[PDB]
A paper describes a structure:
Addressing the elusive specificity of cysteine cathepsins, which in contrast to caspases and trypsin-like proteases lack strict specificity determining P1 pocket, calls for innovative approaches. Hence, we set out to determine the crystal structures of cathepsin complexes with representative peptides of cleaved substrates. As a working model, cathepsin V was chosen because of the resolution of diffracting crystals (up to 1.3 Å) and crystal packing with accessible active site cleft. Reactive site mutants C25A and C25S of cathepsin V were used in structural studies.
Numbering used by the authors:
A (entry chain PA): 450 to 457
B (entry chain AA): 1 to 221
Amino acid sequence: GNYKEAKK
Amino acid sequence: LPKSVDWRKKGYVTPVKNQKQCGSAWAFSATGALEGQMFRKTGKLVSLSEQNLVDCSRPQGNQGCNGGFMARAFQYVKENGGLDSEESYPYVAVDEICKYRPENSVAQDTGFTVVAPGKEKALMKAVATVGPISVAMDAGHSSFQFYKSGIYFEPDCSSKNLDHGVLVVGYGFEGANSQNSKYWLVKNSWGPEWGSNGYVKIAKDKNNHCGIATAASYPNV
Ligand SMILES: [Cl-]
């Protein structure tokens, strides 16, 4: 789970 | 599970691509996983369109060249009914008008499966039984930018604050002993000139290094 940052 | 896995050797992986100056790594990670699952289903390796995902998946919560998430991309392909080929919908590294064409679709998915968060053994079971797996990682370091060879290990890596999507295409180990000097085989989207022909070996079973098993998933085809 990782919505802290978008995966640019 | 096998001591090592390398899906590139079985025809599941397209040549390395380059996102250039666009924050679309999430789109390349998603197309890489869908390319592997479509090949597992049909025996045909077809390069898929990242630009279709950049231009069309804002409703699902992606932001094109400003970032996005692989699970939101697999959601778009499910809701949309298809995804165009790379050849038919070329990559230009800028946000453009959605030009999805159903007649050019070469892939579909019914949703996706998530790997248990933070579990490197669950990720190892998915890589071994399914094919390449989308994963997020902490790539925010000059050690990664200038990585060239060997097992990558960065003390300053985070397992929870991740900024880049990549594709785990296998795992392996150095030497005779399969239980030490382990690594994840990771395909990047910075071109074949970056890293080791566009790939990087990330330390494996070293406490989820750089977050590789924190937010892993794959499409259901
Ligand atoms: Cl995701």
